[PDB]
Amino acid sequence: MPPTFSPALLVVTEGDNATFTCSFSNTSESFVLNWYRMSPSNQTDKLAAFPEDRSQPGQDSRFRVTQLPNGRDFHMSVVRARRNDSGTYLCGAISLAPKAQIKESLRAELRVTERRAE
């Protein structure tokens, strides 16, 4: 039922492929799923989408969407995360029609900790 994005806090190490889970419910039989970073200025920046609504080849390819065999569950991965990727994130969906509008999920935190000594 509700548009969800979890865990509410993900803690990872520098160079990890940091993954969150989105979950969505819709009346529309088909839709675009999309992903955002939320700024301290309270704006949002587009990261990735499925089907790919990212438009341009200037999108950072580290941000990955993968569709799960659950049928309505989705893997949002920051492939090779650095300390600068720490911040707030949130998920969304929108129908294929031109009259559509974005349904957003609740927000979560990404936290990237220092690469350990070995």
From Swiss-Prot:
Residues 3-113 form the Ig-like V-type domain. Ubiquitinated via 'Lys-48'-linked polyubiquitin chains. Deubiquitinated and thus stabilized by USP5. Disulfide bonds join 22-91. It is found in: Cell membrane. Residues 42-67 are annotated as: Pembrolizumab binding. Residues 2-118 are extracellular. Glycans are attached at residues 17, 26, 42, 84. Residues 38-45 are annotated as: Interaction with CD274/PDCD1L1. Changing residue 42 to A: Decreased N-glycosylation without affecting binding to binding to nivolumab drug. Inhibitory receptor on antigen activated T-cells that plays a critical role in induction and maintenance of immune tolerance to self. Delivers inhibitory signals upon binding to ligands CD274/PDCD1L1 and CD273/PDCD1LG2. Following T-cell receptor (TCR) engagement, PDCD1 associates with CD3-TCR in the immunological synapse and directly inhibits T-cell activation. Monomer. Interacts with CD274/PDCD1L1. Interacts with CD273/PDCD1LG2. Interacts with FBXO38; leading to ubiquitination and degradation of PDCD1 by the proteasome. It is linked to Autoimmune disease with susceptibility to Mycobacterium tuberculosis: An autosomal recessive immunologic disorder characterized by lymphoproliferative autoimmunity and onset of various autoimmune diseases in early childhood. Death from autoimmune pneumonitis may occur. This is Programmed cell death protein 1. The chain holds residues 34 to 150 of 288 of the full protein.
